[PDB]
Amino acid sequence: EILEPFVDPPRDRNYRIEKDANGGIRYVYDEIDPVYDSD
Amino acid sequence: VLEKTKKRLTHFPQRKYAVKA
Amino acid sequence: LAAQAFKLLNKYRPETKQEKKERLLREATAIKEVSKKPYTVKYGLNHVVGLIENKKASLVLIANDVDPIELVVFLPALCRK
Amino acid sequence: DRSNIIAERKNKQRVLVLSSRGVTYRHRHLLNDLASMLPHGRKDAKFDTKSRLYELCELAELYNCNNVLFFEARKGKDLYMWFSKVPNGPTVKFYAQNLHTMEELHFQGNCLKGSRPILSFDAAFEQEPYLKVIKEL
Amino acid sequence: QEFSELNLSEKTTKAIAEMGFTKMTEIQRRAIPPALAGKDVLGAAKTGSGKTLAFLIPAVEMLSSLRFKPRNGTGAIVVTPTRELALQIFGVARELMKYHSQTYGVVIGGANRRAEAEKLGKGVNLLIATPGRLLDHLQNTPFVFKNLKSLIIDEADRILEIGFEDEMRQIVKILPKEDRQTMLFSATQTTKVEDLARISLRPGPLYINVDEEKKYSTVEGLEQGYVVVEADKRFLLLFSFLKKMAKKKIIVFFSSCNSVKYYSELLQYIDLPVLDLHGKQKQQKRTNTFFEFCNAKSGTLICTDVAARGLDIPQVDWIVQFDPPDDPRDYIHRVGRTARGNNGKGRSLLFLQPCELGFLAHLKAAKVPVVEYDFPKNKILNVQSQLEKLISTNYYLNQSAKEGYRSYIHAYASHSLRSVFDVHKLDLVKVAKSFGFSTPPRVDITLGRRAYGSQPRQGGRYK
């Protein structure tokens, strides 16, 4: 639906966001399980 | 000599000059 | 289809060296004493591939016996693209 | 069970030793000496210095290793160490010098490769915290 | 009072005298003498009050007084929302610097990146730039702008409405601020407009309102026409319209001055006498064309839509919008009422492609009446064969066709209302058929997981 008569109508994450020690933005990621794979 | 080389020698040849003291 | 292709293409044969020289002697004589663009058949691999890439060609004919065949392997697919 | 640990509680650890593109035979021999002692590690060589530091992470994620020991060489003369917990854990940087390798015939000692060591730490590795983080690493 | 009353350079005053302007308009009188003094100006005029001459005169005089040379780089940057008014200021700047030795250039979107980079490093002194391409050049290309002394932001309200909030806030943070005059103009005063003023202008501006507050935006007394025409017979319908509606008054609106130039030369070869109004003409020839048209009985005039916004439309029998309008709100209200034209019966129509019928839904939302015309297929004058023989053989018409085709597509890409004017719903083979091409010439139609083990940047001089 067109709210305004000639204006344009308005319109996977592998991290968690924490705070780091100095104060900022820290990404913690999925840990890796230490196994030998089949190859 | 090539045609490109003759064209450059025709229009920009070595000149004759001197430098004053 | 090959015979009907060469029926049209023979009508657009390029001028030979004998009759190109004759026409040059005709026009030079008239200067001593008015035409449109010539429509011929285009040839030459490097020329035709460029005519393909600029979409300037309408029909392409490819020889089946080019003995380095790498010169013509991409050419059916390039015309398709 | 895939982590090949036969124990009451499994200590799932893996390291990935690596080399820069300009190490010397003295720095190359320290790969061969350390990795021979280190039984749960893989050898890899010639990491591109034009790459980024965090491309050492998915290199280790490719080989399922939560530790990385990088030998980085500058000028073709200087060894720099890196110990790091690969997914998100802390890292360290050292300057390594005064190198003496196992191939030099003056040590007169030998041991099994892959045998378990005792870790002989120091007293300052406990009291001062900047030694404590590298202690766990 | 007049231009001669100001004490300008005799190089500049000779240029104004050849352009024909003797009397200064409202904004020209109230803005230029404080701008020559050095004070920053905040203007609130609509386009066509003479504002394009109001900021160019101080910028030209600054460059002439300081004796600018091409090695010095840019002295003044004029920021313009879309490329059509950027090319409009270019023609005005060409007429101003006819006698000067300073250089002048255009940076626009949908143009060659590398040719602009060679132009910018070679050294332009007055630069008319669209905001997106200016930030690209300021961030990537090596050119001199350390001596920037003037900044002009023309039609600010369109710039934020188009969507250059982030870009223009980065533009004023990379350009030098000290010893600089910044002049800002906008027709309306919205909330985003003053935040652009607080970041660009100095703490003391000068406030000028020469606005037309009596905006007679009619809501009901209008009737809009439209013709649904396929993309490959747009010109043939224009030609058949103009041929049969000769002995009448016709005004046609295009989207680009390059398409006006090409259609002017083609219609003379196709033998239809049509008048023209584009930016590659003299300013004097521009006025004598329109004065001839306003007093004529019959005739037909081609101009761009941004040219008519600055011009006084006379009583005409039709207003036809061949290309899509620049801003659809100003087309429906202002140009619909001027087509109605006081007393005489004047009708307005708009060319629509089949992929453009959401305009009807937008027209239905604002509740404005429509009538669509039928146009039987027999009465189309199929001069397509004559047109393609001309383009394939004449070299000057081939250049004009290529530039008109590209400017039509490039203006289509940089359209504000992208819901109905979308270039990805355009069959480019058919739209080059109308321009006279069998093969559509090449044009760039465009002009989840983050890194594992990665952390945000904290240090390093990453440039």
Add this chain to the structure above:
Amino acid sequence: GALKYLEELSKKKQSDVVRFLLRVRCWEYRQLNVIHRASRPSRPDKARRLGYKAKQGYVIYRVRVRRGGRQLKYQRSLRATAEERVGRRCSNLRVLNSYWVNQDSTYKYYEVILVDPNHKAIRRDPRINWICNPVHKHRECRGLTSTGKKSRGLNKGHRFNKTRAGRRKTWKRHNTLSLWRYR
């Protein structure tokens, strides 16, 4: 512009059409002589960028060379051996350049471009008539071709300090005791 498509094809020479063509051509070349004459180059893009022209005086010769070790290693490359055998065969021509054309489990196959210095189509062309000079007799024996310059280490830099001006000329210069008059 057909030759741009050929340049990308030679890049992908493990691929299906190029492995097929290299297989069927290596089979054909094994029944042929060790050194034989080719009417046209098998890779016309490579020959042309190496200097080949379709003129009277340019010939193409194909040669197979045994591959493996000489653990003694022959410092002469297989490409340089390919050049030297053809120049012996054609003592009247000049070896211009050579390129890889095929390989097998026992042999490596090279095509060499030669120029006739006595053909007066060659003698009249300023782009090629430098080779008519007698300082270019048997360039493949003196290491003056592209294979020879690689194996002689004639490259700029600190890596090629011993060989960039001639290796033996560098050794003779550094091993010379230079005595002046006023010492």
Add this chain to the structure above:
Amino acid sequence: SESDAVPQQQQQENHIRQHDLELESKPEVLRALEREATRPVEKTVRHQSEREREWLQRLVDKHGDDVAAMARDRKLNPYQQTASDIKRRLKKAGLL
């Protein structure tokens, strides 16, 4: 007075002449060489070819002085030249 800090403004005196250089008690050889440099020269004016004059005269004989129509003409201007090129060739041949 240097508003823009230009290190080249003091040494002043984008197209330049490409073939020559527009230049500004002593020994006898130097004075003799200066008379050779400053000696007046021969113009050696090139001339239009005979067929070129016939092509241009045919254009005047049809269109007069309208340079726009001459460039736009196709029969008498086969190699399509702009009016700026035709105007220079007309002014050289004396046909305005």
Add this chain to the structure above:
Amino acid sequence: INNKEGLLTALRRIQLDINPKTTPFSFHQSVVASKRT
């Protein structure tokens, strides 16, 4: 620069529970000497 609290904070996230309360010596085999050396 030596942020102290953040240093031990990073130590917690990689701290193994090495303690003779539950973990025997065979697990870690890490010895810390009393002498400073």
Add this chain to the structure above:
Amino acid sequence: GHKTTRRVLKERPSRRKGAQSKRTQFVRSLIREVAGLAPYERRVIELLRNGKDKRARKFSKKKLGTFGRAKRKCEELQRIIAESRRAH
């Protein structure tokens, strides 16, 4: 050290002396489709289609010899899988 008025240089025409033109990328995409795939690339394509992306990055590394080349090859072959699926 010493302070000098640094100038802005004209762009060197030898910047990016390889390819960034749209014509060369057209040729490479055409030749790759008309020539086929190498034997090792068929192995990686099979593993990438089966989801064994972990094995595919390792296998390209032993064949090419460098991790950086192994990433680019697996990226190029992944795009081929994407545009072949859309055409199907």
Add this chain to the structure above:
RNA sequence: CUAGUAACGGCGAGUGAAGCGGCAACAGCUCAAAUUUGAAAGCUGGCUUCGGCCCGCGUUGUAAUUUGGAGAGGAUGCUUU
């Protein structure tokens, strides 16, 4: 000259540069990557009354234009044979 310096060394024997700097001499270019496509415009031979005729090479590419601190194509106006 650097300089018996750096470097490598049964670290014994020893081996052993280069950059910078002062000089001598100075010089820059040719291709491949492009469609001449409104005209293979190029070239080897032979016969020749020496003036210009034939064969052949060559489009799987011989001329002209271009060679990345470039260039092409338009436009414009001066300057060169």
Add this chain to the structure above:
RNA sequence: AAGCUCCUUCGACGAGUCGAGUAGUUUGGGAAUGCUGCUCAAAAUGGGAGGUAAAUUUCUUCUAAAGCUAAAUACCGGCCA
């Protein structure tokens, strides 16, 4: 025919070659100093070589796998003085 200027137009740059492992050789020179052989075998905001603890590979400088070219240099031989 040629040089420059301007630009709402374009701008192609060398692969069994780099590179990875390995063996021989060689160098003051395990980024192999270089080369060669064998196995595998690339890229296009690309590649090479540097610089840097400075906090991430920030920056610097060149474009390899085609080719020509006088002078300054050597000289127990050739024609002489």
